[PDB]
């Protein structure tokens, strides 16, 4: 019944402000509490604050009091998070979350938006270079997807026909502020002579679409 | 501020086994306003328990919550494959709501040493002025592993990064990739490129190397 839909990913410069929206459909918007919760890469959930639209009653975590504003528009059933004075450590997925019902409200967050990635960075859009990791009973081979911005990149092998033994790793953020990732596959050594291995790399922001043949 | 401690932060268990997860609060949680959430990789959290012991309709009845005051427990009566995930507790008994740091429930399996592979830089990359050397540690368990890069037997610092996959859904292993990055000019100053791997499954460190 209740669905929360957030605005799309944002890249913001250090010191700027970001606004994320959350549109609710189904249920009653005005009399149920809406919170914002963030999660930095590889880290835990952090409650930031919330609003009760009907009363315009906000509640901010002390850590964010002075940099956060949460607002609600009853006419569009939309809540907004504004976070100011952004720093690289504000890079995170930001979720909206609405309390559940037994209806009688429960406080705990039954309904979650899909999340919004906010990346705080001075970098500009850049497509990756794609380099082979050539193979030397089992061989390893792969592709190095180097120096791109922003996230994400997707990788498949053989247009999705090859999934067994594939490992696509999380990206790392380099000192340049650009990302790098690797993708590998292990295969029988006997298959290297005759079978073709192609890594399909997609970086939508730069329109980089590479189908790299990896050979001995 | 109420601090919620989830200890241990990881539990390694088998499918079919019982799990009990602890949440200890630094002070009494008002009216037992304690919730539990599950989160799978790349997904939003899902509410399992609210009010310490109440279970929403649609949540499997193998999940139960108990406790009061500062001592709360999430019980999973019998782990199914989909239950291997991260679990967070949350208190909302004060206007300042807080979460615990999470407990990851992962699949226990036999120790597996990594298979180690080293990849020199591609001729394509060398044309561009940079050299990346990659070390792959494939299909090991448990997750703890160490990689050291040595260049002409000199330990490297500040010029490598690594990442680790999620636990494999079929064989319950992890893999790790590390990249050492140099300028082409610095890469051409040295001969021996080595990655040295430490893991529970290895009685002594494994070194893979090549000569430029």
């Amino acid at each position: 019944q209740v669905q929360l839909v957030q605005s799309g990913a944002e890249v913001k410069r250090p010191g700027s402000s970001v606004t994320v929206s959350c549109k609710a459909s189904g249920g009653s918007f005005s009399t149920y509490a809406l919170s914002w919760v963030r999660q930095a890469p590889g880290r835990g959930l952090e409650w930031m604050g919330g609003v009760i639209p009907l009363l315009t009653i906000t509640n901010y975590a002390p850590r964010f009091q002075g940099r956060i504003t949460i607002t609600a528009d009853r006419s569009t059933s939309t809540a907004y998070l504004e976070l100011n004075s952004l720093r690289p450590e504000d890079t995170a997925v930001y979720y909206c979350a609405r309390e559940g019902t037994t209806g009688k409200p429960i406080g705990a967050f039954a309904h979650w938006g899909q999340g919004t990635l906010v990346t705080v960075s001075s970098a500009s859009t850049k497509g990756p270079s794609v380099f082979p990791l050539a193979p030397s009973g089992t061989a390893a081979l792969g592709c190095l997807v180097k120096d791109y911005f922003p996230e994400p990149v997707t990788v498949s092998w053989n247009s999705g026909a090859l999934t067994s033994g594939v490992h696509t790793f999380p990206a790392v953020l380099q000192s340049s502020g650009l990302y790098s990732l690797s993708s590998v596959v292990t295969v029988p050594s006997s298959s290297l002579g005759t079978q073709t291995y192609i890594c399909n790399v997609n970086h939508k922001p730069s329109n980089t679409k590479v189908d790299k043949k990896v050979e001995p | 501020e109420i601090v919620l401690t989830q200890s241990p932060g990881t539990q390694s268990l088998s499918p079919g086994e019982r799990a009990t997860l602890s949440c200890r609060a630094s002070q009494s949680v008002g009216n037992n306003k304690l919730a539990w959430y599950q989160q799978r990789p790349g997904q939003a959290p899902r509410l399992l328990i609210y009010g310490a012991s109440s279970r929403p309709s649609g949540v499997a009845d193998r999940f139960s919550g108990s406790g009061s005051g500062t001592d709360f427990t999430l019980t999973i009566s019998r782990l199914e494959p989909e239950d291997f995930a991260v679990y967070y507790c949350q208190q909302y008994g004060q206007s300042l709501s807080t979460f615990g740091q999470g407990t990851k429930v992962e699949v226990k399996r036999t120790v597996a040493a990594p298979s180690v592979f080293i990849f020199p830089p591609s001729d394509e990359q060398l044309k561009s002025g940079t050299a990346s050397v990659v070390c792959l540690l494939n299909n090991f368990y448990p997750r703890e592993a160490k990689v050291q890069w040595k260049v002409d037997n000199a330990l490297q610092s500040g010029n490598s990064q690594e990442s680790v996959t999620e636990q494999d859904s079929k064989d319950s292993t992890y893999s790790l990739s590390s990249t050492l990055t140099l300028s082409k000019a610095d890469y051409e100053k040295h001969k021996v490129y080595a990655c040295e791997v430490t893991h529970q499954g290895l009685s002594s460190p494994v070194t893979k190397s090549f000569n430029r």
Partner: peptide
Amino acid sequence: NWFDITNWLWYIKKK
């Protein structure tokens, strides 16, 4: 406790 306000709003909007 701010997390109790909507319960009060629910109670008063029933009757």
